[PDB]
Symmetry: C3
């Protein structure tokens, strides 16, 4: 009965000499995301959306990115919540992400102890507009539903 | 009950020589989007998201299908997976033109296409305060959220 | 009862000299503040839009139009409270609110709990059903240059 929603946002810069790691999947690319972790922009957005839904603050109040997402899952359960579903969008002009998506999903499902059909990941270009459109960064948006058991 | 949430995003460049079609409604304007219906794309993505069926690109690579047909085909696929739609909410970010006059039309299109009571569909509008490409009239963005139940 | 609905909201405002910085109803010590017709509380407007959105009552402009002079310098908390009242009058109880503020500066952490408390008070909710998150934009874009602050919101309600 006690449903809650959460929403998450992250962005990271694309820089030289860094691997591109999105949703736990390493992707061949001439740049990668800049950050104090592996800078996995998708997993940060989902992490914030889960903390948001459980009213536990945000990632920076709490903290590689899969370990952090697993810890997030732990704290959400610690607070009395179970995760019903996650959905997300990755905004990246390049590279193409569609062939890596089911893998990201599998990664996320494992990390949150959820079946595949409750996790979703989607991708969009930014039509060459703004910093996203010139490939200067990548954005992720997330939504999460939990229930307080 | 087994509720699920989905979220959607889209953006399109704003240029002359195309008509402005948002939420299935053609809007008097000197420019249009490169139908490129940013609102219906966002919502479609939100619905596939809630059902966990990937995204609009994965379903529709439909050669001469407008975004309303795509939206209708989206809804049918969501139904087939066991999910009934509960509501949709959305925001259009457009520095111009004025969209308020067109909102009831957009909601009527969407509610028709999703087979929903009008009071379960909402569309909102915002400017970008002259900031960025949106605030300079170089593009328009849509955001959407959908709740479904299986 | 099980008639749940979701809403989402978005707002942005320019950051300029000579205005008070008010986010989540908290006045933040800062050499700049948000520009708008009301007090420009970007976070509260985003949450307000999300609530109207969940209830299918249109948007903040429909209810409290910037073409109306009475909302000049309007207290966005009073606006949030009227929004919640109209949402309740449409038949909805609010279950939770989540949100994100994106700003290069100032540091918002020391003010976040107070924002959450204001919102909880205005929505007549306990603290554990309201969340506020803060993000930098990693130095990217007009947000990264400090030209504005953006807020995003999500709300879940139930028709009683
Ligand atoms: N393309 C647009 C832009 C906005 N609006 C209407 O104008 C209202 C106000 O838009 P906006 O100026 O972006 O809102 P705020 O900036 O939050 O207002 P304020 O400055 O008072 O905070 C919206 O809610 C909407 O009803 C519209 O119909 N079409
Ligand atoms: N203007 C801001 C922005 C973020 N923050 C805090 O900083 C943390 C996140 O910062 P960030 O966006 O740099 O996170 P990363 O993307 O670097 O992981 C959160 O805990 C926020 O509450 C803040 O206090 N003030
Ligand atoms: N980096 C990306 C971007 C998009 N895509 C796919 O491409 C589709 C269309 O994206 P787009 O940005 O061209 O969207 P529209 O131009 O159709 O609005 C998405 O729905 C995804 O399926 C991808 O696989 N990888
Ligand atoms: Zn991050
Ligand atoms: Zn599109
Ligand atoms: Zn505002």
């Amino acid at each position: 009965m006690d449903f809650r929603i959460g929403q998450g946002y992250d962005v990271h810069q694309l820089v030289p000499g860094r691997p591109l790691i999105i949703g736990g999947v390493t992707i061949p690319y001439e740049r990668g995301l800049l950050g104090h972790s592996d800078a996995d922009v998708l997993l940060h957005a989902i992490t914030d959306a889960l903390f948001g839904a459980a009213a536990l603050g945000d990632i920076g109040r709490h903290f590689d990115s899969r370990a952090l997402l697993r810890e997030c899952a732990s704290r959400v359960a610690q607070a009395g919540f179970a995760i019903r579903n996650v959905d997300s969008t990755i905004i990246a002009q390049a590279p193409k992400l569609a062939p890596h998506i089911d893998a990201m999903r599998a990664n996320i499902a494992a990390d949150l102890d959820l079946p595949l059909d409750r996790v979703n990941v989607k991708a969009k270009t930014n039509e060459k507009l703004g910093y996203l459109g010139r490939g200067e960064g990548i954005e992720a948006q997330a939504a999460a539903l939990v229930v307080r058991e």
